[PDB]
C-alpha cells in the first residue's frame, strides 16, 4: 500500500471547505 | 496497490467544497 | 503502509475550514 | 471499503462567485 | 474501512466570493 | 478504521471572502 | 408569507432500531 | 413573515435503540 | 417577523438507548 | 386563520425525528 | 390567528428529537 | 394571536432533545 | 387587520418564503 | 391591528422568511 | 396596535426572519 | 502483513449501518 | 505485522452504527 | 508487531455508535 498525492494551487483568492 | 495523483490548478479566483 | 502527501498553496488570500 | 479514497457531501449548498 | 482516506461534509453551507 | 486519515464537518457554515 | 409554518431538515439523518 | 413558526435542523443526526 | 417562535439545531446530535 | 394540527404516535418502541 | 398544535407520544421506550 | 402548543410524552424510558 | 406592505430585494441569489 | 411596513434589502446572497 | 416599521439592510450575505 | 477480522451479530431485530 | 480483531454483539434489539 | 483486540457486548436492547 502506497499513496503519492501532490496538490498544488495558486491564485489571487483561494477558498476551500 | 499504488496511487499517484497530481492535481494542479491556477486562477484569479479558486473555490472548492 | 506508506503515505506521501504534499500540499503546496500560494495566494493573496488563502482560507480553509 | 479497503484501500479506498472517499469523498461525500450531503445537504443544502449555495455558492456565489 | 482500512488504509483509506475519508472526507465528509453534511449540512447547510453558504459560500460567497 | 485503521491506518486511515479522516476529516469530517457537520453543521451550518458561512464563508465570505 | 405573513402567517407561516416552516420546517426544514438538511443533512445526514438516521433512524434505526 | 410576521406571525411565524420556524423549525430547522442541520447536521449529522442519529436516533437509535 | 414580529411575533415569532424560532427553534434551531445544528451539529452532531445523538439519541440512543 | 386557525391551524388545528394533531400528531399522535403509540407503540412499544418508538424512534422519531 | 390561533395556532392549536398538539403532539402526543406514548410507548414503553421512546427516542425523540 | 394565541399560540396554544402542547407536547406530551409518556413511557417507561425516554430520551428527548 | 389592515396590512400595507412593501418589499424590494436585489441580489445574485435570493430565497423568499 | 394596522401594519405599515417597508423593507429594502440588497446583497449577493439573501434569505428571507 | 399600530405598527409603523422601516428596515434597510445591505451586505454580501444576509439572513432575515 | 496479515490481518484477521471477525464481525458477528445475532438478534431478533437487527440494524447494521 | 499481525492483527487480530473480534467484534461480537448479541441481543433482542440491536443497532450498530 | 502483534495486536489482539476483543470487543463483546450482550444485552436485551443494545446500541453501538
Numbering used by the authors:
A (entry chain G), B (entry chain A), C (entry chain M), D (entry chain E), E (entry chain K), F (entry chain Q), ...: 1 to 17
Excerpt from the paper describing this PDB structure:
Supporting this hypothesis, we here determined the fibril structure of two AMPs from amphibians, uperin 3.5 and aurein 3.3, by cryogenic electron microscopy (cryo-EM), revealing amyloid cross-β fibrils of mated β-sheets at atomic resolution. For both of the studied ffAMPs, cryo-EM data unambiguously prove an amyloid cross-β structure comprised of β-sheets with tightly coupled dry interfaces and strands perpendicular to the fibril axis. Despite the dissimilarity in lateral fibril structure and the difference of extended versus kinked β-sheets, the 17-residue ffAMPs uperin 3.5 and aurein 3.3 are remarkably similar in their residue composition. Overall, compared to other amyloids, the sequence content of the two AMPs indicates a dominant apolar and positively charged nature, which fits the functional interactions with negatively charged bacterial membranes.
A recently developed computational screen aimed to identify fibril-forming AMPs (ffAMPs) additional to uperin 3.5 found fourteen new sequences, including aurein 3.3, another amphibian AMP secreted by Ranoidea raniformis (Southern bell frog). In contrast to the case of uperin 3.5, we did not observe any pronounced polymorphism of fibrils formed by the antimicrobial peptide aurein 3.3. Two of those (chains E, F) are arranged in a cross-like shape conforming to C21 screw-symmetry along the fibril axis and form kinked β-sheets in their inner section which closely meet at a roughly 90° bend near Gly11. Wrapped around this inner cross are four more strands of mutually similar conformation, each having a sharp in-plane kink near the outward-facing His12 residue, which is enabled by Gly11 leaving a void into which Val14 can fold. The outer chains, in particular C and D, cross the fibril normal at an unusually large angle and are strongly bent in the plane of their respective β-sheet, which, together with the screw symmetry of the inner cross, leads to a complex staggered structure of the fibril without well-defined rungs. The overall packing of the aurein 3.3 fibril is highly dense, with the SASA buried for a single layer (fibril cross-section of six lateral chains) covering 9802 Å2, which is 83% of the total area of this layer. In the outer chains C and D, the C-terminal part of the kinked β-sheet forms tightly mated β-sheet interactions with the C-terminal part of the inner chain F, overall showing a stable interface of three short β-sheets, resembling lateral association between β-sheets in the crystal structures of short amyloid segments. Overall, the lateral association of β-sheets in the aurein 3.3 fibril shows very few potential polar interactions and is mostly stabilized by van der Waals forces. Here we show the cryo-EM structure of aurein 3.3, revealing a cross-β fibril with kinked β-sheets. Such sharp kinks in the peptide backbone are the hallmark of Low-complexity Amyloid-like Reversible Kinked Segments (LARKS) within functional amyloids.
